[PDB]
């Protein structure tokens, strides 16, 4: 069971990292804009918050995986 | 919902979902048909293999490429490729999600219409959009002012943009790409004794190209060094347990890019096309385009292409101007990485072409924004 | 002085002097080695027969071909052939006169160097030159604009020229020639009961091919006519007083030229290669090449090949365009007839490679003009 749950934790960590990469790329594009469309102004904030949430989720997942180890 | 972002290419198919960092599936765009009789009973007949299974069983198949030079020649094969991508590879029904496709600039009009019809009447997607390959690169790069230099298989094109105002008269297109380099590699490998003729042997030559090639900083000096000594030699192994030994041909294949007269063509090297594109724009924006060059496509993965590009452009361009070649890693997927970003954007979610719009307006709809 | 013009071929050797209308000597390029013990005393043990005497005593010899597919495989046998040609056959010492040789296009580099060394260090000729087989055909034909289609034993190649500017990227090469036809003739003669296995039996099959073969204008109708009636039957006599009776196989052997899928190959017929070569040149010169086609080599002596070639090319090529197949008689020696003419020309007498030039520059000399 220990090995299986460790594997599932690894998979979840991989998925989280994959999401972080895309969100960072989108924010990197959106930052350069100078007079963004009103919708983009809110989308930028939404993405900025989502990146944070994903980062703490990643920290928690890696901490749990290490604790199993 | 998630919007698929397929990139039908000239030599590979990359299909995936929006909001990702890599294509979900990647596989060659070939169709193989059996060549021999077939003697065993029970096997279960198959008219044609498609995708990677064809690449696996290349021994007894006649591989064909439905696309060439960006244009699409065979339509049944392309429809087969699309069906395989949507059902067998991605494993998602196409009805629920929209779709985003990419098409190279200056292509024939009819292509766009036929693609639209095949993506509405037969597959029944609720909304489809098509974008220029070069433009999507700048989203992945992360800037707005630049001159992309997408160089895929089949063709290579240059599209300069400034503050998000694409200049259409400075766009350039050229038909020198990886397939010509593969053919030249076969032709020059003929000298040492190794003779490759069949299509599968061409596939082997393509792998040889991918693994063992590089671009010399200077050409004549490299020839002199390779002729005098014997240090520029590499050994490769065929599937049949035979060893090829490549010498000069390591840097005579990609050199065709900068000297298109090897193949009998007449156009100028790619550095000259980039410089001409830059000098075909206005006077006030040339400095910015010099500052930010961009590379994309698989063909620009040769070790040392960035250095030679920078050196040649610096030699051609006036002094007092600073030139950088933004050449990030993982450039291979750069175009695709743009599309997913473009799909994610909230504003872009208003720019699709709904099915009823195409039903009412007609085929011309797609060209209104062309 | 007179300059020898030898044409080392893939299945025949033709050697002669300049300013003539035919080769002085012509003989097969084979080497026969004895197979059995030898019981009589006083005969004097020879180790290998060479040339025509081997063909005379094929009963108790194991005939071998030093050349294959243009490339030279065995070098001792080739040197023996050259020595026999210069001393026993021509009966002229090689020191006094220069020499002109012919080599097919796209062959390995090493061949040229080794031939040069064997023609300088060992035989000590005062000057040697080597020329492409296809080019010499145009001197014999009498024109300058054309697309030769030399088809010798071993291999066949196409070289289009326009105003004496050979296009190198349009050259085509293919490994379908008379030897494959002989093997196919053996394989299909197997059906009726006649079994030929040994090398001398292959030599007999080659004679059967030479005498009784032709090319049908259309294939399916010819097969139907041959099956329905019994008029397409011929009787031939073996050396052992036995009678073979050939039917359909009369026109299934040469048909392999236009349908290379009979022997398991994958390339296209020769008409398709000619059309592709023509359509790989520039737009403005295709008409002249269409007008003036040329054939050479022994393999193109099948009765009716010219008509089928013209019909196929006319069907493939666009209308409004006039096609002729210049197919003069005595085409067998056409290539050789070129060389002698090339030797005679006063200008050409400045282009040899003197012995001291090779001694100083080194082996690379020959390749400078390649
Ligand atoms: N690492 C590499 N080094 C050199 N050439 C490469 C490399 N990867 C791919 N290529 C060349 O690029 C071609 C594939 O291009 P691709 O990325 O499919 O362009 P597109 O997406 O427009 O079809 C291949 O045919 C291959 O010859
Ligand atoms: N009259 C003919 N009819 C049919 N085939 C022929 C004829 N003469 C020669 N051949 C074929 O051509 C071959 C000889 O080719 P050759 O003219 O020697 O080419 P090369 O000069 O390049 O060696 C022979 O093997 C034979 O099978
Ligand atoms: Mg691409
Ligand atoms: Mg010949």
Numbering used by the authors:
A (entry chain L): 212 to 280
B (entry chain B), C (entry chain A): 7 to 376
What sentences appear in the manuscript?
In a screen for effectors that alter actin dynamics, we identified a *Legionella* effector, Lfat1, which colocalizes with the actin cytoskeleton in eukaryotic cells. Lfat1 specifically binds F-actin through a novel actin-binding domain (ABD). Furthermore, we demonstrated that Lfat1 exhibits lysine fatty-acyltransferase (KFAT) activity, targeting host small GTPases. The head of the hammer is formed by a globular domain (NC-domain), which is contributed by both the N-terminal (residue 1-137, red) and the C-terminal lobes (residues 356-469 pink) of the protein, while the handle of the hammer is formed by an elongated, anti-parallel, coiled-coil hairpin (CC-domain), which contains the middle portion of the protein (residues 138-355, cyan).
The CryoEM density map of the complex allowed a complete resolution of the actin subunit in the F-actin filament, including its bound ADP and Mg^2+^ ion ([Fig fig2], [Fig figs3] and B). The cryo-EM structure also revealed the distal portion of the coiled-coil hairpin, which consists of about 1/3 of the entire Lfat1 ABD domain ([Fig figs3]). The structure revealed that the two α-helices of the Lfat1 ABD domain are zipped together by a stretch of hydrophobic residues, mostly leusines and isoleucines ([Fig fig2]). The ABD domain radiates away from the central F-actin core with its tip of the hairpin region binding to the site between two adjacent actin molecules within each strand of the F-actin filament ([Fig fig2]). The ABD domain embeds a surface area of 3703 Å^2^ on the actin filament, which is contributed by both the D-loop region of the n^th^ and the hydrophobic cleft of the n+2^nd^ actin monomers ([Fig figs4]). Several hydrophobic residues (Y240, L241, and L244) located at the tip of the ABD hairpin are accommodated by a hydrophobic pocket formed between the two adjacent actin molecules ([Fig fig2]). The hydroxyl group of Y240 of the ABD domain forms a hydrogen bond with the main chain carbonyl group of V47 at the D-loop; the amino group of D248 of the ABD pairs with the carbonyl oxygen of G48; and the side chain carbonyl oxygen of ABD Q254 makes hydrogen bond with the main chain amine group of S352 of actin. Moreover, salt bridges are also observed between R236 of the ABD domain and D27 and E336 of the n+2^nd^ actin monomer ([Fig fig2]). In the Lfat1 ABD and F-actin complex, specific hydrogen bonds are formed between the backbone carbonyl group of D-loop residues V47 and G48 and the ABD residues Y240 and D248 ([Fig fig2]). These hydrogen bonding interactions cause the D-loop to insert slightly deeper into the hydrophobic cleft and induce a unique conformation of the D-loop residues G50 and Q51 (*Bos taurus* numbering, equivalent to G48 and Q49 in *G. gallus*) not observed in other structures ([Fig fig4]).
